[PDB]
Structure 1
Amino acid sequence: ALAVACGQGSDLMDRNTENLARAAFIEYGGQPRLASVRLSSRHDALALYLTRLVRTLWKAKVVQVDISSTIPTSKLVTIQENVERLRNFLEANKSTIQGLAPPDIANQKEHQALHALQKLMESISEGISFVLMLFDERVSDIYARLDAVSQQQLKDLTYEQLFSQTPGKELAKVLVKAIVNRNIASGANVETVADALRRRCGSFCSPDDVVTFKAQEQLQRASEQAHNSPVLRALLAESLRLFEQVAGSLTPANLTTAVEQYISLKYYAGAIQLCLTVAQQKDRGN
């Protein structure tokens, strides 16, 4: 019923059938009970459907090392669409489906269980979007300019780990921090790759990182335009504005790369002002 309600079988009246399927999912889904709890058949059905949508992904490695993707991109798209249509179905019926809205111990764990599944769904969609973003770039190029531990972590990274384990999230945060670096070398567009990472895979990307990426953009593009005289004083001055904003949140690894570049461009006095500013914003109370 859940599947039909989400449009499955419709690749073959159809609104009424899907509305009937919705009615069957609500009316006959059961309820949670004390036996440790026994969750409703409605919950197990949602878990069963979701699992079967990602069964080809879960235990599979993300990549195959000339690195490529284990799962074809076209398959990742359809899986994501199916997960999203399931999410859309739960949102449009948050008020009528038991357990979605907040509610005694039985209905409590029913709400917690259903909530956890929905958080996994959005994490699945974010994870898939991240993999698609990754292979839109030149991963082999990114994979080359990488440390061994992170190459090994990426070698045996599964979709399960990407979706549900901190190391996948931490590694994802490293890869995004690396792809933008490379994107700046190609230099097609920084602010487009920004809004790409900002929204779709939000909750895994950080807005303090994109402003940093915007700063490293002008820095590298100030090294690109380095031969020009009057164009840099606008690039380096605007890079400095971007750095000082995220001063209370710059990593020592980035702050160094910034100062290293400033010295190449004889921007001595400016680089000193950034480090002084980063200091005060890490310890405002002095």
Structure 2
Amino acid sequence: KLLCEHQFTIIVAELQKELQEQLKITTFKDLVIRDKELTGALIASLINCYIRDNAAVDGISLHLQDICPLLYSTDDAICSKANELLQRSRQVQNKTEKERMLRESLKEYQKISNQVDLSNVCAQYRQVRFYEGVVELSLTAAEKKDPQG
């Protein structure tokens, strides 16, 4: 319903083509019982429209949290907010505000750190010279893998 209302045909055209063709052969009972990549990629495309076309992802993340308690889609929504701030930090030319939005982006990833692609996030920090968040998030991604020592 949410994908129909956010103009559908747009969000489906943002997908990888291999998923655009899989979408035509997966039945609703396959999408419910068996699939995860089509459902995750449709959420990811909906949010990449918000990030690219520069809406605030908070105003779709909070809607996905009412309608997608599977396992709770709060962590996809936090990762999406952490990513929104990280990709906007690549366009911010105001240094102190880039250092703000990187320490904000970091404090979203520092919640969900057990489930973060730390290699990709820390490489995406190298791509903005944010070596501070590479030390912090990589410790906060060991901190909670072994909380017992």
Q: Is the 8 A contact 1:215 1:243 kept in 2?
A: yes
CA distance in 2, matches of 1:242, 1:210: 10
Q: CA deviation at 1:134?
A: 6.0
Percent identity, aligned pairs only, is: 28
Which of 14, 19, 26 lines up with 1:142 in the alignment? 14
CA distance in 2, matches of 1:282, 1:178: 30
Question: Is 2:70 the counterpart of 1:203?
Answer: yes
Give 5+ residue unaligned stretches, structure 2.
none
Look up the match of 1:157: 26
Question: Is 2:136 the counterpart of 1:268?
Answer: no
Q: Is the 8 A contact 2:113 2:141 kept in 1?
A: yes
Question: Is 2:86 the counterpart of 1:223?
Answer: no
Q: Is the 8 A contact 1:223 1:261 kept in 2?
A: no
Q: CA deviation at 1:256?
A: 3.2
Q: Which runs of 4+ in 1 moved over 3 A?
A: 133-137
Look up the match of 1:186: 53
Q: CA deviation at 1:186?
A: 1.5
CA distance in 1, matches of 2:45, 2:7: 13
Q: Is the 8 A contact 2:89 2:102 kept in 1?
A: yes
Give 5+ residue unaligned stretches, structure 1.
1-128
Q: Equivalences for 1:56-95 in 2 at 5 Å? A: none
CA distance in 2, matches of 1:257, 1:178: 19
Structure of greater relative contact order (alpha carbons < 8 Å, 6+ residues apart): 2
Question: Is 2:142 the counterpart of 1:259?
Answer: no
Cα RMSD, aligned residues only: 2.4
Look up the match of 2:4: 132
Which of 123, 140, 144 lines up with 1:277 in the alignment? 140
Flag the 1:137–1:241 CA change in 2: closer, same or farther, 3 A.
farther
User: How many residue pairs get matched?
Assistant: 149
CA distance in 2, matches of 1:219, 1:131: 25
CA distance in 2, matches of 1:203, 1:218: 26
Q: Is the 8 A contact 2:65 2:72 kept in 1?
A: yes
